[PDB]
């Protein structure tokens, strides 16, 4: 039970949207160079996967 980017593939990060919530979304793949992750969302109607960057907008790492 780790709500946030644990930097591990398969970790459940917090993504914002849909409800404007930071909802536990799962990392499917990580790009470390650009610093993006292929995140798979549970509550997401358009697509289910997306490449977004950590805390660039709607992505939150772990508590700290």
Swiss-Prot record:
Q: Where in the cell is it found?
A: Nucleus
At the top level, the lineage of the source is: Eukaryota
Q: Where is the Tudor domain?
A: 5-64
Q: What does this protein do?
A: Is a negative regulator of proteasomal degradation of a set of methylated proteins, including DNMT1 and SOX2. Involved in the maintainance of embryonic stem cells pluripotency, through the regulation of SOX2 levels.
Q: How does this chain assemble?
A: Interacts with methylated DNMT1 (DNMT1K142me1). Interacts with SOX2.
Protein name as it appears in the record: PHD finger protein 20-like protein 1
Q: Which gene encodes it?
A: PHF20L1
């Amino acid at each position: 039970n780790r709500p946030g980017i644990t930097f591990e593939i398969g970790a459940r990060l917090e993504a914002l949207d849909y409800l404007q919530k930071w909802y536990p979304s799962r990392i499917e793949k990580i790009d470390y160079e650009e610093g993006k992750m292929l995140v798979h969302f549970e509550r997401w109607s358009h697509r289910y996967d997306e490449w977004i960057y950590w805390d660039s907008n709607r992505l939150r790492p772990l508590e700290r």
